[PDB]
Amino acid sequence: TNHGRITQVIGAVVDVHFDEQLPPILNSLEVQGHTNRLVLEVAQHLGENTVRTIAMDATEGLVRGQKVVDTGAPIQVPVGVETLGRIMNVIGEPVDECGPVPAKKTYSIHRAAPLFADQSTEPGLLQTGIKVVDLLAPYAKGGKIGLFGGAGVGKTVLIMELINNVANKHGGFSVFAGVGERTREGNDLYHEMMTTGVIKRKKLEDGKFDFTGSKAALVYGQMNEPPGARARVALTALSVAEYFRDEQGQDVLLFIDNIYRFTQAGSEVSALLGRIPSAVGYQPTLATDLGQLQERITTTKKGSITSVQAVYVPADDLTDPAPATTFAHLDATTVLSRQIAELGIYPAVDPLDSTSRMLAPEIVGQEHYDTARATQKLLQDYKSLQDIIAILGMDELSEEDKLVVSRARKIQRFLSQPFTVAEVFTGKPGRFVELPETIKSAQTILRGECDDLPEMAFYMCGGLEEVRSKAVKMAQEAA
Amino acid sequence: NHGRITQVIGAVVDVHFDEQLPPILNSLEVQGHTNRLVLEVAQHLGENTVRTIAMDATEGLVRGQKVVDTGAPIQVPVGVETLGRIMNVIGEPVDECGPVPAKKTYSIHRAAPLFADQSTEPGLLQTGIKVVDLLAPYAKGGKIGLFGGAGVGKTVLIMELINNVANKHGGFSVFAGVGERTREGNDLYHEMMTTGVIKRKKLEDGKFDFTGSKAALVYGQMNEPPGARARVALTALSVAEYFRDEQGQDVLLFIDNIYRFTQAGSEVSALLGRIPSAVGYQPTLATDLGQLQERITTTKKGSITSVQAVYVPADDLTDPAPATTFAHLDATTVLSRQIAELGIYPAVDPLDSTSRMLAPEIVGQEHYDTARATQKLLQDYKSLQDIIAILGMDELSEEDKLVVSRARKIQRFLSQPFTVAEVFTGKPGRFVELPETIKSAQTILRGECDDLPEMAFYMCGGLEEVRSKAVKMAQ
Amino acid sequence: EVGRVVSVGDGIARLFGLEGVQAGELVEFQNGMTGMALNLETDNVGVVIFGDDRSVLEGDSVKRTGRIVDVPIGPGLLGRVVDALGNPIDGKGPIPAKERRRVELKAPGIIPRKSVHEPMMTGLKCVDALVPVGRGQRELIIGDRQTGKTAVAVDAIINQKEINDSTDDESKKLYCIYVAVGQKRSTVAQIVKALEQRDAMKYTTVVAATASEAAPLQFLAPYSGCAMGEWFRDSGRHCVIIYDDLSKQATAYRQMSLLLRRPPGREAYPGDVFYLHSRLLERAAKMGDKSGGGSLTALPVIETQAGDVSAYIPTNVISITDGQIFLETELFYKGIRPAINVGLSVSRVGSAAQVKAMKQVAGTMKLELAQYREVAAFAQFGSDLDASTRQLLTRGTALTELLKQRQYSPMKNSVQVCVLYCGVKGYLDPLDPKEISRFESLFIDYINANHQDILKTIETEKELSEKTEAKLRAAVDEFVAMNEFKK
Amino acid sequence: ASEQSARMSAMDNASTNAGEMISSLTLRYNRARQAKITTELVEIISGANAL
């Protein structure tokens, strides 16, 4: 092992001097003589056998001339079935207070993406049990998914519902990466995973633990952590999933909360690393740093990784560089809106901004494609009539336009549904709606069969039959 | 200690001392120069080098000139001898009446009074102005702000407050001119010599006798460098602190405009080698202001009431300067250009204006209720501006039309002809007591004045004038 | 070791020496002034001074104490006003506290935590009903200038004296900490006076980093307050900490970073503002039964300009909090005081931080207010409406007139329950809106005169059985009979 | 008939007023656009010269 000396300290940026045998970039360095473990990741070579590194933990307590040891390799995270049922940090250390990870292997979080020759697979359809998603923005089994939205629109709830409706039924493994989210959310997720069998902790009389089963692995880089950790925790989780993809060959599920935080972390240090800022304060190495991540998330001829990324959109501005760049990296897209959530329509998915590569007549049949496109046409027509209604009124609209407005309102209210995890907000029970039922109901509503039925009936109903039951109840209570 | 000028950049001078350095804020005198150039130390730079800000123009300086350290910061005289006398930032009188024979001098820079030495007793002032007496009552012994752009009536309002308060005060008073027109300074000096606030008398031997004066004057105007503008308010504050500390008497301090003080820093920090903040302002935009405002405070010894006119560039209230200044004020008065274009003067926006002395535990519940009803009415009228501009008043209901009528009436009623405006308005001034304002507002809100026209409330003061004008307008 | 000052300016020093300095430790000059080392460059060291720079003279000796910047903690702070560093400014005695705590610390992890289930009684009606707050929560109070934020926080502080006086169990008492950043000493003195006038200081402390105080104190004061509250959090005693305003802290940090020649970012701020506020607010938590069971609630305050929450600091602090209490000037002047916009204001915790007795009423109230907000604009124009729509308007107007409150006039939870019961079951629809402001007051006095048992039962059982329901209905009937209003 | 005549007149006046408001808002939009460009560029430059 080499030996170096800390030269200066500026926030989360640390310059280090070596007498000989400089380490390559991305290598990991360990500070010696500190309270807790402190790892640094090489980022730049400056000259005079000097390097510039990014600290994973706080630099408080560091001293110039303090000693540093090169490990000869980048941050190696443990992998295997031993990480399952267990929480891990950015540097692989556990933070679950259950013991160390007895892994027989370690992978470097920094790897090269699979080449073009390693093609994808067929666009397999993924059934989530959600209506608007399965109808208008079908999710692919082997492709990337995006959940765009600001603050207070239902990203975390939707990911939790997807976990309840997919991860439990999934025969492969699954991974979660908390990238700059709230820690309370992590505690809640861990408890819910221990509850629903996705994690199986069994304490022993000798003080050890047993996580047998427990088809899930958790990684956390939350807001309390500094930059350097929030950035690399995503690569950590992605390597943990790449192990199961390449070697085991099992299908894997990756959930990321939020990816935007990862980009923000880079900006927090770029100006300290001597870079000139980009347009709105972001770093120059935005698109590349994000693509080097995203290209590692892809299906190959050995396995498949289905990812679900929640993308914070600050100030509800989709023109921001981070989501603007992320849009191009996704197979399926789902944009959540505040104007819809104000109407109590949860999930607050905007069906006119959500898209999907899979929505084509050759993949999903024409009964699905034409139904979705008719729904979208109806909603756009209702959106174009908004100003005429606001100025003149409903009196001016013809009966065709009134029928259009009625059907569009019914569709809007019908795409809503209650989740199982939102019981603690609404109190109502959860529903799992299969896709043929959704298509039947949408065809029925668009054909004009349900014009007689009241608009209120189509609220938080899994199926059209439930809507009929609610209408019957409301009519009976009317007299 | 002697020193040498090594570098000159506009209003900044870097000097080199050999033996011993002077501390920061210390004054330095340049010897080989026509006038009395004074330099205030700001930084230390190593190599026994010092950076300084000049209180006068640097045209004529040479790299090699000699500089003398005075050993103390700038010293301004204090006492009853500064009364009825003008004094620049370095204390030198520019009244052409002789020197200042004061015994004691205070430093321009003093630490603010502590936490324990404060007394927040709520009082009120009698400004005679309807809008501030009703909706933004001014606090005796607190800070008051007049925010506005250019051409909305801050200076006229300050002059009206002078005529209606300082003459009826009895105690002392101070006026600081920080980047204002020299014309209005001479006008104020002569108006003060007229009203008896300054009692100048010429003795047989050319000397003067200002005995009887009740107002000092400090003027650092637009025809001054930035260094002589960023240190005038501190001079005035020392002059007022002497009164409310040793004398223990209430004093009134008027500042026109305070924003200029920050502006000087903006045109200095670039030369001091500092990174600029958002809009080119300084990173020290808040501390340099808080260190000035915290010296203004009522204490257990005396009290300083303050009336500061705060410029607002480009009519943007989100600018850092007024945004920071809002946090230091006990009462606020935001002037508007949209209201001045309607001929309403004072052009006070009664919704952006506010105060801390409006609660019912200070003023009565009738005053509080009248003010809040007026605010509700004006907000309800503001909420209809878009639909009135696009569609028209005909779309509105009858309740909304009654609201619009009463809101226009109460807008026009909150318009007062001052005494100092007689030179460009012609109509005489109208002092207005508070109970008359409250009765008039109550009557206009109830509906006891809907029969009258709308142009009968324009520049009338009370209601008897409004009814007389409506009578004369019936013809 | 020792060092010597090389450069001085604008409350910042550049030293030569002290090769064994810890980044973030205290430093002492030869005149009593202190400093904090931040920029450990190669040649020099960048220190920020805790006071004026007139004392430092470019050659003064400097010495490191070895202590990381820390503050005292304990019950000795209760009833006292102190600066950012624990030095008192009340002017009455020193701080009797033996144990200290580091300012910058690592927040608690995922395992030693639990869900939020206990409420934090704010004293207001709209907050405690529609925007509930829990113990372990981090709820922002964001608005414009002069809208009623400090008033909300001070009412939250004042409501606790009854709850604390009627017990001696520290596990149930709620202590409070008021951090004043950027304020002027007159305002802090007014707040201290308002609290002493109501005996609300024997359980509070204050941390005043005012405007005359240098930037580093404004930057460190909230972390000092969190350190003082972590004592309660880890000892099993609940505490609530209020930051007034946090934005002022961000401004101070920008000043320090710009004078240390660090490069800026958006709006001249650094990139580390998010880390600054995340470091600060993630220390609020609800610990488990193994770690004592304590809590540290946070109620930060933010002043927006022109209601622009699309700005840089508001966006961050919105994205790292568990709620929002928006405040508007339009609603403030229309008559709604507190000016809480119940549409934008939310609380992710929600009913879990609410009592069952308040759930039963607040669900219906939220639904009714949603409907009223939806049809309020249409109603103003004036058109024929169905009886149901008119009823909705009448009930929404009644509830809106109910949620109004005087300043420094908070209320207990049971009284809120009773009043909102009167409002929800239809005992205010025919009544004149403007009359409700006394229907409330009188009703309160009535149920504090003759029906103390109902209040005690609601306080103990924390629910509304059918017996209490019927008793409350009978009381309301008696009250309406005994009194008369305009309708 | 009188109602319909008044309706046409009102629509005329409303369209005219809307055009005026559009002109004013166009001026304000261009001003804000220029301000945004200048502000972003000054931020980038100040971050570039502080190196």
Ligand SMILES: Nc1ncnc2c1ncn2[C@@H]1O[C@H](COP(=O)(O)OP(=O)(O)OP(=O)(O)O)[C@@H](O)[C@H]1O
């Ligand atoms: N419930 C209330 N009822 C009536 N007035 C209120 C109420 N709450 C606050 N106010 C009034 O609002 C005004 C501002 O008070 P407050 O101290 O809360 O200001 P703020 O919102 O904190 O803004 P800032 O401190 O920056 O000036 C005061 O006059 C106060 O009396």
Ligand SMILES: Nc1ncnc2c1ncn2[C@@H]1O[C@H](COP(=O)(O)OP(=O)(O)O)[C@@H](O)[C@H]1O
């Ligand atoms: N399906 C839903 N049903 C009811 N309320 C919801 C739903 N989804 C979100 N909300 C509300 O919005 C809040 C958003 O919190 P969260 O799920 O974390 O979304 P985000 O992270 O995007 O802000 C929830 O606490 C809840 O009050």
Ligand SMILES: Nc1ncnc2c1ncn2[C@@H]1O[C@H](COP(=O)(O)OP(=O)(O)O)[C@@H](O)[C@H]1O
């Ligand atoms: N009460 C008033 N009555 C008539 N005109 C006024 C009044 N107040 C201000 N004005 C006009 O507006 C202009 C404001 O100039 P000034 O008094 O210097 O205010 P400011 O300091 O904001 O520029 C004056 O020239 C005056 O013609």
Ligand SMILES: [Mg+2]
């Ligand atoms: Mg979330």
Ligand SMILES: [Mg+2]
């Ligand atoms: Mg002027």
Ligand SMILES: [Mg+2]
């Ligand atoms: Mg406040």
